[PDB]
């Protein structure tokens, strides 16, 4: 609603599903990922990006900065258990 509060439409992702499925299809062990599953994986990925951005911004804020730098993202992966799966990508 325009003159009302923000209303989210659930059951949809802002990501291009074909591109998410392309990544999903790289998994050697998966026989078939259903469309409903792909959609949930897509939304989870949205939530992941938001989580990572938020944590990286919080570190920027402690250093009195208004923007995210690469070292902020890296320090998040370096220090936070939930981001352990990224440890190789950041070569830490």
């Amino acid at each position: 609603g325009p003159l009302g509060s923000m209303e989210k439409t659930y059951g949809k992702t802002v990501l291009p599903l074909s591109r998410v499925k392309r990544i999903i299809k790289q998994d050697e062990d998966v026989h078939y990922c259903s469309n409903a599953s792909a959609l949930l994986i897509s939304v989870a990925t949205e939530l992941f990006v938001e989580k990572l951005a938020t944590e990286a911004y919080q570190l920027a804020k402690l250093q009195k900065r208004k923007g995210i730098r690469y070292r902020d993202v890296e320090d998040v992966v370096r220090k936070d258990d939930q981001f352990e799966f990224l440890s190789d990508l950041f070569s830490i």
Partner: protein
Amino acid sequence: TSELDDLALPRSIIMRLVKGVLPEKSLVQKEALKAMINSATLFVSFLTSASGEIATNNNRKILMPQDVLNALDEIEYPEFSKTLKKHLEAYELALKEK
């Protein structure tokens, strides 16, 4: 890798997600946005793999929505569960309609 770059989700859609949780006029530099685009790709793979395991452990070939929801516990992102369940309910509801 050229593989990461080929798989990467659109830089502008990821940028909007990032800026969506930051104060107005916050900036995000190139090396950082890139790192998060690539992190998103690894997250898709991470959640997918854990979900496929649960499908397999249930002797199923189809990776199903409940496998993704249960995979959140295995990858220790249970804070996403309530939101995903809401999407699933809405998804199925729209499906019958459409």
